[PDB]
């Protein structure tokens, strides 16, 4: 599924991402846009053989196991295939551990290069929330 900006903003607010660890909802929507372009099936393979899955491009060498990434730490103790669902639930759950683990939203490269320091609330204004 390829969410629409406001559609995803709504679905993320419903999963309590708003102000999670103090991160306003705009951050999570902005991160999603430059990570997966809102595509829940997006999967990008990396040079080290690992792959980034889902709406929040979670990596397979550290967060999820996809069965083909040697050394997978699988920190979110979940398969990667579970992150390609139209239901962002699994992704949000994992995304929450990554953040509460002290990594912050820095863990997301796209967030640090395209959202951090900008007026992130622009990403949700004009939305029925």
């Amino acid at each position: 599924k390829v969410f629409g900006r406001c559609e995803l903003a709504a679905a993320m607010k419903r999963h309590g991402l708003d102000n999670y660890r103090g991160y306003s909802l705009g951050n999570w929507v902005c991160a999603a846009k430059f990570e997966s372009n809102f595509n829940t099936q997006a999967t990008n393979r990396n040079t080290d053989g690992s792959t980034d899955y889902g709406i929040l491009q979670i990596n397979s060498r550290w967060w999820c196991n996809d069965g083909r990434t040697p050394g997978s730490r699988n920190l979110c103790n979940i398969p990667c295939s579970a992150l390609l669902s139209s239901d962002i639930t699994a992704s949000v759950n994992c995304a929450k551990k990554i953040v509460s683990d002290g990594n912050g939203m820095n863990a997301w490269v796209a967030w640090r290069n395209r959202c951090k320091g900008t007026d992130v609330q622009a990403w949700i204004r004009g939305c029925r929330l």
Epitope: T47, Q57, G71, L75, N106, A107
Partner: nanobody, 132 residues
């Protein structure tokens, strides 16, 4: 956490040296380990980095082909093999790690060549001196 570096010393131009660095006190990670060097009158230069586990490497243009960095059996220890050392290579070498476990793929050489951004843990510098 603590970074333990060893090796280095003095050597004649053309010789080789091998530095090593041991990260201690990590539950997970580090994600990146690399080396920075500071010579007198010059800017702090990022020399080499590697994505822990994944093994992917990055090198400054000034040491490409001469230096080689590697990991040791995921033992959280990395080595820096320096060949064709020249006196310009004379400097203080620092071992550094990036403790963040990124969600999406991250290339360690990126922060390496942009002020060491992301590398939050540094070790005691080690003097390397290449004489003529």
């Amino acid at each position: 956490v603590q970074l333990q570096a060893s090796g280095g010393g003095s050597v004649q131009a053309g010789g080789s040296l091998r530095l090593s660095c041991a990260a201690s006190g990590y539950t997970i990670g580090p994600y990146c380990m690399g080396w920075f060097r500071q010579a007198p009158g010059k800017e702090r230069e990022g020399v080499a980095a590697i994505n822990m586990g994944g093994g992917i490497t990055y090198y400054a243009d000034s040491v490409k082909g001469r230096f080689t960095i590697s990991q040791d059996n995921a033992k959280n220890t990395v080595y820096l093999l320096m060949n064709s050392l020249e006196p310009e290579d004379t400097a203080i070498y620092y071992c550094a790690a990036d403790s963040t476990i990124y969600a999406s793929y991250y290339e360690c050489g990126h922060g390496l060549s942009t002020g060491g951004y992301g590398y939050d843990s540094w070790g005691q510098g080690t003097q390397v001196t290449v004489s003529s």
